[PDB]
Design a protein around this motif. Structure first.
Motif, PDB file in Angstrom:
ATOM      1  N   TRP A   1     -25.175  -0.646 -56.354  1.00  0.00           N
ATOM      2  CA  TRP A   1     -24.907   0.295 -55.263  1.00  0.00           C
ATOM      3  C   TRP A   1     -24.809  -0.351 -53.865  1.00  0.00           C
ATOM      4  CZ3 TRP A   1     -22.350   4.103 -53.723  1.00  0.00           C
ATOM      5  CH2 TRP A   1     -22.724   4.921 -52.637  1.00  0.00           C
ATOM      6  N   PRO A   2     -25.766  -1.215 -53.497  1.00  0.00           N
ATOM      7  CA  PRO A   2     -25.657  -1.809 -52.156  1.00  0.00           C
ATOM      8  C   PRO A   2     -24.359  -2.592 -51.958  1.00  0.00           C
ATOM      9  CG  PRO A   2     -27.848  -2.178 -53.056  1.00  0.00           C
ATOM     10  CD  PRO A   2     -27.013  -1.602 -54.179  1.00  0.00           C
ATOM     11  N   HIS A   3     -23.778  -3.079 -53.048  1.00  0.00           N
ATOM     12  CA  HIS A   3     -22.535  -3.842 -52.984  1.00  0.00           C
ATOM     13  C   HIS A   3     -21.243  -3.021 -52.922  1.00  0.00           C
ATOM     14  CE1 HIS A   3     -24.960  -7.424 -53.500  1.00  0.00           C
ATOM     15  NE2 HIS A   3     -25.522  -6.864 -54.556  1.00  0.00           N
ATOM     16  N   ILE A   4     -21.253  -1.821 -53.500  1.00  0.00           N
ATOM     17  CA  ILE A   4     -20.080  -0.955 -53.409  1.00  0.00           C
ATOM     18  C   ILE A   4     -20.140   0.160 -52.372  1.00  0.00           C
ATOM     19  CG2 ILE A   4     -19.539  -1.470 -55.818  1.00  0.00           C
ATOM     20  CD1 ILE A   4     -20.359   1.574 -56.386  1.00  0.00           C
ATOM     21  N   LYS A   5     -21.301   0.345 -51.755  1.00  0.00           N
ATOM     22  CA  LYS A   5     -21.527   1.503 -50.894  1.00  0.00           C
ATOM     23  C   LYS A   5     -20.561   1.539 -49.701  1.00  0.00           C
ATOM     24  CE  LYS A   5     -25.370   3.704 -48.393  1.00  0.00           C
ATOM     25  NZ  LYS A   5     -24.833   3.876 -47.021  1.00  0.00           N
ATOM     26  N   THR A   6     -20.340   0.388 -49.079  1.00  0.00           N
ATOM     27  CA  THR A   6     -19.519   0.349 -47.879  1.00  0.00           C
ATOM     28  C   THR A   6     -18.080   0.772 -48.160  1.00  0.00           C
ATOM     29  OG1 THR A   6     -20.887  -1.330 -46.795  1.00  0.00           O
ATOM     30  CG2 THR A   6     -18.593  -1.110 -46.040  1.00  0.00           C
ATOM     31  N   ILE A   7     -17.496   0.227 -49.222  1.00  0.00           N
ATOM     32  CA  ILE A   7     -16.130   0.580 -49.594  1.00  0.00           C
ATOM     33  C   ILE A   7     -16.038   2.023 -50.086  1.00  0.00           C
ATOM     34  CG2 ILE A   7     -14.258   0.132 -51.237  1.00  0.00           C
ATOM     35  CD1 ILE A   7     -15.095  -2.833 -51.131  1.00  0.00           C
ATOM     36  N   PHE A   8     -16.958   2.410 -50.965  1.00  0.00           N
ATOM     37  CA  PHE A   8     -16.900   3.733 -51.580  1.00  0.00           C
ATOM     38  C   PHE A   8     -17.150   4.861 -50.574  1.00  0.00           C
ATOM     39  CE2 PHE A   8     -16.704   3.676 -56.401  1.00  0.00           C
ATOM     40  CZ  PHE A   8     -16.114   2.427 -56.448  1.00  0.00           C
ATOM     41  N   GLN A   9     -18.152   4.711 -49.714  1.00  0.00           N
ATOM     42  CA  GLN A   9     -18.382   5.732 -48.698  1.00  0.00           C
ATOM     43  C   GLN A   9     -17.307   5.700 -47.614  1.00  0.00           C
ATOM     44  OE1 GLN A   9     -22.564   5.215 -47.530  1.00  0.00           O
ATOM     45  NE2 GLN A   9     -23.090   6.869 -48.969  1.00  0.00           N
ATOM     46  N   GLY A  10     -16.765   4.519 -47.351  1.00  0.00           N
ATOM     47  CA  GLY A  10     -15.706   4.379 -46.369  1.00  0.00           C
ATOM     48  C   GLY A  10     -14.452   5.152 -46.739  1.00  0.00           C
ATOM     49  N   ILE A  11     -14.021   5.055 -47.997  1.00  0.00           N
ATOM     50  CA  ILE A  11     -12.806   5.752 -48.418  1.00  0.00           C
ATOM     51  C   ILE A  11     -13.033   7.219 -48.796  1.00  0.00           C
ATOM     52  CG2 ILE A  11     -11.748   3.604 -49.227  1.00  0.00           C
ATOM     53  CD1 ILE A  11     -12.256   4.464 -52.070  1.00  0.00           C
ATOM     54  N   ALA A  12     -14.287   7.587 -49.044  1.00  0.00           N
ATOM     55  CA  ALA A  12     -14.602   8.944 -49.472  1.00  0.00           C
ATOM     56  C   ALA A  12     -14.203  10.000 -48.436  1.00  0.00           C
ATOM     57  CB  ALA A  12     -16.098   9.064 -49.795  1.00  0.00           C
ATOM     58  N   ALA A  13     -13.883  11.191 -48.924  1.00  0.00           N
ATOM     59  CA  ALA A  13     -13.774  12.361 -48.062  1.00  0.00           C
ATOM     60  C   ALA A  13     -15.049  12.509 -47.245  1.00  0.00           C
ATOM     61  CB  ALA A  13     -13.555  13.619 -48.905  1.00  0.00           C
ATOM     62  N   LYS A  14     -14.907  12.965 -46.002  1.00  0.00           N
ATOM     63  CA  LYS A  14     -16.073  13.281 -45.171  1.00  0.00           C
ATOM     64  C   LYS A  14     -16.172  14.783 -44.950  1.00  0.00           C
ATOM     65  CE  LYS A  14     -16.370   8.786 -44.338  1.00  0.00           C
ATOM     66  NZ  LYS A  14     -15.093   8.353 -44.974  1.00  0.00           N
ATOM     67  N   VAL A  15     -17.390  15.292 -44.785  1.00  0.00           N
ATOM     68  CA  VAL A  15     -17.525  16.654 -44.307  1.00  0.00           C
ATOM     69  C   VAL A  15     -17.465  16.647 -42.775  1.00  0.00           C
ATOM     70  CG1 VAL A  15     -18.754  17.481 -46.350  1.00  0.00           C
ATOM     71  CG2 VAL A  15     -20.054  16.538 -44.414  1.00  0.00           C
ATOM     72  N   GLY A  16     -17.480  17.831 -42.172  1.00  0.00           N
ATOM     73  CA  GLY A  16     -17.182  17.957 -40.753  1.00  0.00           C
ATOM     74  C   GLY A  16     -18.247  17.382 -39.841  1.00  0.00           C
ATOM     75  N   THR A  17     -19.430  17.157 -40.400  1.00  0.00           N
ATOM     76  CA  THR A  17     -20.529  16.546 -39.666  1.00  0.00           C
ATOM     77  C   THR A  17     -20.537  15.031 -39.858  1.00  0.00           C
ATOM     78  OG1 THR A  17     -21.896  17.268 -41.522  1.00  0.00           O
ATOM     79  CG2 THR A  17     -22.025  18.548 -39.501  1.00  0.00           C
ATOM     80  N   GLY A  18     -19.618  14.544 -40.686  1.00  0.00           N
ATOM     81  CA  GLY A  18     -19.417  13.115 -40.842  1.00  0.00           C
ATOM     82  C   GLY A  18     -19.954  12.467 -42.108  1.00  0.00           C
ATOM     83  N   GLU A  19     -20.815  13.158 -42.856  1.00  0.00           N
ATOM     84  CA  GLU A  19     -21.374  12.546 -44.062  1.00  0.00           C
ATOM     85  C   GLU A  19     -20.296  12.324 -45.118  1.00  0.00           C
ATOM     86  OE1 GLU A  19     -22.716  15.264 -42.697  1.00  0.00           O
ATOM     87  OE2 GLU A  19     -24.624  14.535 -41.914  1.00  0.00           O
ATOM     88  N   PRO A  20     -20.334  11.165 -45.793  1.00  0.00           N
ATOM     89  CA  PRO A  20     -19.327  10.887 -46.826  1.00  0.00           C
ATOM     90  C   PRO A  20     -19.614  11.661 -48.111  1.00  0.00           C
ATOM     91  CG  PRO A  20     -20.935   9.089 -46.690  1.00  0.00           C
ATOM     92  CD  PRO A  20     -21.235  10.023 -45.550  1.00  0.00           C
ATOM     93  N   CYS A  21     -18.604  12.131 -48.850  1.00  0.00           N
ATOM     94  CA  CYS A  21     -19.037  12.792 -50.053  1.00  0.00           C
ATOM     95  C   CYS A  21     -18.895  11.727 -51.110  1.00  0.00           C
ATOM     96  CB  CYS A  21     -17.955  13.842 -50.340  1.00  0.00           C
ATOM     97  SG  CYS A  21     -17.673  15.081 -49.010  1.00  0.00           S
ATOM     98  N   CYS A  22     -19.908  10.879 -51.089  1.00  0.00           N
ATOM     99  CA  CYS A  22     -20.165   9.892 -52.093  1.00  0.00           C
ATOM    100  C   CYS A  22     -21.577   9.422 -51.774  1.00  0.00           C
ATOM    101  CB  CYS A  22     -19.149   8.765 -51.892  1.00  0.00           C
ATOM    102  SG  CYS A  22     -19.506   7.253 -52.785  1.00  0.00           S
ATOM    103  N   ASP A  23     -22.427   9.334 -52.776  1.00  0.00           N
ATOM    104  CA  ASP A  23     -23.744   8.751 -52.633  1.00  0.00           C
ATOM    105  C   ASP A  23     -24.136   8.402 -54.056  1.00  0.00           C
ATOM    106  OD1 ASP A  23     -26.103   7.827 -51.567  1.00  0.00           O
ATOM    107  OD2 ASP A  23     -26.918   9.804 -51.066  1.00  0.00           O
ATOM    108  N   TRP A  24     -25.156   7.573 -54.217  1.00  0.00           N
ATOM    109  CA  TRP A  24     -25.576   7.228 -55.562  1.00  0.00           C
ATOM    110  C   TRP A  24     -26.080   8.471 -56.300  1.00  0.00           C
ATOM    111  CZ3 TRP A  24     -24.321   3.361 -58.451  1.00  0.00           C
ATOM    112  CH2 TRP A  24     -25.015   3.137 -59.653  1.00  0.00           C
ATOM    113  N   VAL A  25     -25.493   8.737 -57.462  1.00  0.00           N
ATOM    114  CA  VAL A  25     -25.855   9.905 -58.245  1.00  0.00           C
ATOM    115  C   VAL A  25     -27.131   9.699 -59.056  1.00  0.00           C
ATOM    116  CG1 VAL A  25     -25.127  11.439 -60.124  1.00  0.00           C
ATOM    117  CG2 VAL A  25     -23.453  10.681 -58.405  1.00  0.00           C
ATOM    118  N   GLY A  26     -27.215   8.561 -59.735  1.00  0.00           N
ATOM    119  CA  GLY A  26     -28.332   8.299 -60.621  1.00  0.00           C
ATOM    120  C   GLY A  26     -27.957   7.337 -61.730  1.00  0.00           C
ATOM    121  N   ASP A  27     -28.840   7.217 -62.718  1.00  0.00           N
ATOM    122  CA  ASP A  27     -28.764   6.161 -63.723  1.00  0.00           C
ATOM    123  C   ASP A  27     -27.646   6.339 -64.745  1.00  0.00           C
ATOM    124  OD1 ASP A  27     -32.201   5.354 -63.752  1.00  0.00           O
ATOM    125  OD2 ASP A  27     -31.473   7.252 -62.917  1.00  0.00           O
TER     126      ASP A  27
END
Length: 467
Positions: free
Chosen positions: A149-175
């Motif tokens: 996760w720490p290695h893909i987070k920047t790219i994955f959250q960067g390209i993800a859709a954002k909500v209007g407050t700015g949060e990316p709709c991508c985060d680590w889901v789980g195992d």
């Protein structure tokens, strides 16, 4: 090693994700099993970009910055395993493979475990939003080996859709397979939301006798409320859409939604794991029933229904709105119960609030309501059921009189409401300390000596000689 990441498979989804990453400043190495497609992509859709190609897997791997990151977007099943098998001998310990395809979560779990044992970090990621979403931002639902996760987070959250407050709709889901499990549930939830809107529509049309544009306006008005969502937005637009002859188009459309659709897997999962996800089940079965079109034409000539609506129209329309909202709350409570059960079965830690956020953005089911679900888990990350959160408790309480009126009236009018009714039945069951199921236990003990437990002594199995 000048490329930040690689992506394998050049169909439109993969191309679009590559271009999205490119637009966000990442250098992407493109690859495809038929390598001529790499040149074609570079010459056309990727012309003038920073995208680079590779003519072999070995070359592709050589171009990547370590830890190497490789996305697979290829046909689910054997194609994924076959690329994994070809990649492993080429990679180094700590390198990362991300399957962003439509994969079955059990396969993802298997791959995660097997690759971990080989020193390779595996992520399965749900991807929602289709081709347009992939291009300008997807919802992404990564799960897997969290070391990645720490290695893909920047790219994955960067390209993800954002909500209007700015949060990316991508985060680590789980195992393990959790990301793909979450994508599966999202697919079922979608069926539920669409069927709910259909039942509301049917009540407007056949109980309230509303005109097409009037129903469009009702949905538009509803979209300014707690119900604000993409599905309601497009429903309003659909209802007012006129064909070339000036007649509304929707009434011309065949009402058959299919028997084979992927939503079935969520309901099957619920049954496998013993979770009462009743609304999605009814939504899937409603599509199946709709597919019986010739049978229904024949039945309509044979079978009779019951009625004239005498009440206040504006008030009843509001009752329908509240029935829809309450039923939606129950559906999502059920979907989250399924997520919770899977977590228990596999020992997964799931990011429940994050999942709600991920279901905004590129997802068809995106809604303000989903933000309220995130809020509930943010208030209490230990929340056991959505219905117990104060916001949702208050909402259902405020809707329930309307909900019962809408259902009662629809029943008297003969309007099918498989989802409204299952949601209400579920709510009434879940809130009861005592249910009649004790009679099932007694019946089985009577006929099969299966035994039963006393309320006062759970876990102790008793047989009574009833005769």
């Amino acid at each position: 090693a000048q490329a930040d990441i690689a992506l394998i498979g050049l169909a439109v989804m993969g191309q679009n994700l590559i271009l999205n990453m490119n637009d966000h400043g990442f250098v992407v190495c493109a690859f495809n099993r038929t390598v001529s497609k790499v040149d074609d992509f570079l010459a056309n859709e990727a012309k003038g970009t920073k995208v680079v190609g590779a003519q072999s897997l070995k070359e592709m791997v050589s171009k990547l910055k370590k830890p190497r990151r490789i996305i697979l977007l290829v046909k689910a099943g054997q194609a994924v395993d076959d690329f994994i098998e070809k990649l492993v001998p080429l990679l180094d310990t700590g390198d990362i493979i991300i399957d962003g395809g439509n994969s079955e979560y059990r396969d993802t779990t298997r791959r995660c475990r097997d690759l971990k044992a080989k020193g390779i970090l595996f992520v399965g990621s749900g991807v929602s939003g289709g081709e347009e979403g992939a291009r300008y931002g997807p919802s992404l639902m990564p799960g897997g080996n969290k070391e990645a996760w720490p290695h893909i987070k920047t790219i994955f959250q960067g390209i993800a859709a954002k909500v209007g407050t700015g949060e990316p709709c991508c985060d680590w889901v789980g195992d393990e397979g959790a990301g793909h499990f979450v994508k599966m549930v999202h697919n079922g939830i979608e069926y539920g939301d669409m069927q709910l809107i259909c039942e509301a529509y049917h009540l407007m049309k056949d109980v309230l006798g509303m005109a097409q544009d009037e129903m469009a306006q009702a949905f538009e008005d509803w979209n300014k409320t707690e119900l604000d969502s993409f599905l309601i937005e497009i429903t309003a637009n659909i209802l007012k859409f006129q064909d070339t002859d000036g007649k509304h188009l929707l009434p011309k459309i065949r009402d058959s939604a299919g028997q084979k659709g992927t939503g079935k897997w969520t309901a099957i999962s619920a049954l496998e794991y013993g979770v009462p996800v009743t609304l999605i089940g009814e939504a899937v079965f409603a599509r199946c029933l709709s597919s019986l079109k010739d049978e229904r034409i024949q039945a309509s000539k044979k079978l009779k229904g019951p009625f004239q609506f005498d009440g206040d129209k504006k008030s009843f329309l509001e009752d329908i709105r509240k029935a829809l909202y309450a039923s939606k709350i129950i559906s999502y409570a059920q979907g989250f119960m399924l997520l919770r059960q899977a977590a228990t079965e596999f020992g997964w830690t799931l990011n429940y609030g994050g999942i709600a956020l991920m279901w905004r953005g590129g997802c068809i089911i995106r809604s303000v309501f989903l933000g309220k679900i995130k809020d509930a888990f943010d208030r209490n990350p230990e929340l056991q059921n959505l219905l117990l959160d104060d916001f949702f408790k208050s909402a259902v309480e405020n809707c329930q009189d309307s909900w019962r009126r809408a259902v009662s009236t629809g029943v008297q009018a003969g309007i099918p409401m498989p989802c409204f009714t299952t949601a209400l039945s579920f709510y009434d069951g879940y809130r009861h300390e005592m249910l009649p199921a004790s009679l099932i236990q007694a019946q089985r003990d009577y006929f099969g000596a299966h035994t039963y437990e006393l309320l006062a002594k759970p876990g102790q199995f008793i047989h009574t000689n009833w005769t």
